[PDB]
């Protein structure tokens, strides 16, 4: 139930009759650089690692912190919980049989200090009936002397793009082992050329 990988695109396909809409995530086949066994940690968990960026461009602390079990020369070295790794190197020729289910998370597209009209989806002042401050500004945010404080958690202008985001249950319309491509009928967060890790959940009777 795993695979670290670089989201590539969002591109339609047709299906028998109805048409489906996969994104096309590559999954090259990372070298599990470190088991986290469990005597040593609570997790029991893999630390693997995808694409490879030239040998010299490297602090030697990774040269050997990567050398021990030894894969080769790469950077997207991230960790995930609960997955024995019989293989010396995962690949998804059979990590994922097509048509199962999958749970994807990858970093979201940025925004910079996007405003309140964004943030909480609603907002606005009415326009053109008077506004010293037209349309899109946050409304009042409290109440006099109930506390004299903004209630601590509440909505406000902020920064809404650099966040990690997941998308849970969604269909894997098809693996394709050759170029280690994978097709996941849906959205999948990210830029593209971007980064994503992939795992599982789906128990419910629905």
């Amino acid at each position: 139930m795993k695979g670290i990988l670089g989201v590539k695109v969002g591109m339609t396909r047709i299906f028998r009759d109805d048409r489906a809409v996969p994104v096309t995530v590559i999954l090259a086949g990372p070298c599990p650089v470190v088991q986290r066994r469990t005597p040593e940690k609570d997790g029991y968990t893999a630390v693997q690692l995808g694409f490879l960026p030239q040998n010299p461009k490297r602090v030697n602390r990774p040269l050997k912190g990567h050398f021990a079990k030894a894969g080769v020369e790469p950077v997207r070295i991230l960790r995930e919980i609960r997955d024995f790794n019989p293989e010396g190197d995962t690949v998804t020729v059979e990590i994922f049989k097509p048509g199962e289910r999958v749970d994807v998370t990858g970093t979201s597209k940025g925004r910079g200090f996007a405003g309140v009209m964004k943030r909480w989806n609603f907002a606005g002042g009415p326009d053109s009936h008077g506004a010293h401050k037209i349309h899109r500004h946050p409304g009042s945010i409290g109440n006099r002397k109930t506390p004299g404080r903004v209630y601590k958690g509440k909505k406000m202008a902020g920064h809404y793009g650099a966040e990690r985001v997941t998308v849970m249950n969604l269909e894997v319309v098809d693996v394709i082992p050759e170029e280690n491509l994978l097709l996941v009928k849906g959205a999948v967060p990210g830029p593209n050329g971007g980064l994503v890790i992939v795992r599982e959940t789906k128990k419910a009777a629905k």
């Binding site: 009759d17 109805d18 048409r19």
Partner: protein, 122 residues
């Protein structure tokens, strides 16, 4: 496809080829309307004689001038907004209508009758 308050062609029996859509009718909260959704609606114009004066009658929207994206995956759209008037359950008062033949509307299942009924030319 959208219509909260609107005008809308009609041409069964009907007082016109025009009616007012009051509030649409599904799921309590509502907002919009696809074909096959019932839409209760007033009848802004009355054909002389005829059988629908100036009241309001429930009726199913057909066509929509809005790009509905099909499951077979393609999308009919036509420069018109035209309901058919309906009675009680889901029927037709008049048996005549002017619209293209075609489907989806039957896939709604509620009214296989209209799709049976709606001809060809125009």
């Amino acid at each position: 496809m959208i219509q909260p308050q609107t005008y809308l062609e009609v041409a069964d029996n009907t007082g016109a080829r025009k009616i007012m859509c009051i509030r649409v009718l599904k799921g309590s909260n509502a907002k919009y309307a696809t074909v096959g959704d019932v839409i209760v609606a007033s009848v802004k114009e009355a054909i002389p004689r005829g059988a629908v004066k100036e009241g309001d009658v429930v009726k199913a929207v057909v066509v929509r001038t809005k790009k509905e994206v099909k499951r077979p995956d393609g999308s009919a759209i036509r420069f018109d907004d035209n309901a058919a008037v309906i009675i009680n359950n889901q029927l037709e008062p008049r048996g005549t209508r002017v619209f293209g033949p075609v489907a989806r509307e039957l896939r709604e299942k509620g009214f296989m009758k209209i799709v049976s009924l709606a001809p060809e030319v125009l």
